[PDB]
Amino acid sequence: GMTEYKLVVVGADGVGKSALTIQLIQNHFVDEYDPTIEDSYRKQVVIDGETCLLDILDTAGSAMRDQYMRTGEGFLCVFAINNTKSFEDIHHYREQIKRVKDSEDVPMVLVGNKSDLPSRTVDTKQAQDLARSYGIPFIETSAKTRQGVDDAFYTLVREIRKHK
Ligand SMILES: Cn1cnc(Cn2ccc3ccc(CNCc4[nH]c5ccccc5c4[C@H]4NC(=O)c5ccc(O)cc54)cc32)c1
Numbered sequence: 001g002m003t004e005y006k007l008v009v010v011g012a013d014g015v016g017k018s019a020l021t022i023q024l025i026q027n028h029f030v031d032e033y034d035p036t037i038e039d040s041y042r043k044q045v046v047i048d049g050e051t052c053l054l055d056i057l058d059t060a061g062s063a064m065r066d067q068y069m070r071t072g073e074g075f076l077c078v079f080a081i082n083n084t085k086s087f088e089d090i091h092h093y094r095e096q097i098k099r100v101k102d103s104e105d106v107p108m109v110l111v112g113n114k115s116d117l118p119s120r121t122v123d124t125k126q127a128q129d130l131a132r133s134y135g136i137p138f139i140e141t142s143a144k145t146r147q148g149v150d151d152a153f154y155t156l157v158r159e160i161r162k163h164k
């Protein structure tokens with residue numbers, strides 16, 4: 001049948017949360033003003049024979065934050081591979097989400113975005129080590145080339161499906 005999955009994309013300003021979401025929904029990467037930007041996004045796909053209705057919230061980097069964290073079922077934790085501070089922020093997002101949801105098992109996927117860029121300051125191994133501490137998948141993405149974009153969102157749905 002049909003099941004909705006509320007996904008929340010979190011991470012520092014400028015890592016590419018909006019660009020990743022727009023690549024998945026609108027199949028484009030644009031540097032200028034984009035009129036397709038909206039309050040939340042929707043995409044229907046089939047995963048494991050179930051019609052999955054992805055309902056995605058693209059956030060900014062407290063009452064509203066707590067409400068979207070409690071409402072959200074899965075979290076895409078995004079950093080940019082050429083921005084060490086955005087990677088350092090990840091553990092703070094993870095602890096904040098766990099504290100707000102009062103849960104030890106929160107579906108999450110760690111996303112290392114801007115993989116198309118040559119200016120890499122966070123190695124793949126560093127991100128894999130942080131992800132293994134949480135027992136969550138780590139996926140390298142590029143909203144520009146689409147590398148790993150589909151994988152990041154559907155792996156998060158699969159993590160929610162396993163949790164449920
Ligand atoms: C705030 N906002 C987001 N989209 C709209 C557009 N919109 C207008 C009516 C209308 C009805 C239905 C939906 C689908 N769900 C939107 C959505 N996707 C999420 C994915 C993950 C976590 C939270 C959401 C939500 C919001 N729902 C909530 O309870 C909530 C609480 C706090 C929020 O900051 C946002 C939401 C859009 C709607 C408004």
Ligand SMILES: Nc1nc2c(ncn2[C@@H]2O[C@H](COP(=O)(O)OP(=O)(O)O)[C@@H](O)[C@H]2O)c(=O)[nH]1
Pocket residue numbers: 011012013014015016017018019020030031113114115116117141142143144145
């Ligand atoms: N080269 C490259 N630029 C990206 C990528 N994702 C986002 N950007 C750019 O980085 C800037 C910030 O992106 P944005 O989606 O607004 O980040 P957000 O603040 O996390 O929502 C913009 O100039 C984007 O075009 C990516 O994968 N590769």
Ligand SMILES: [Mg+2]
Pocket residue numbers: 017018019058059
């Ligand atoms: Mg944005």
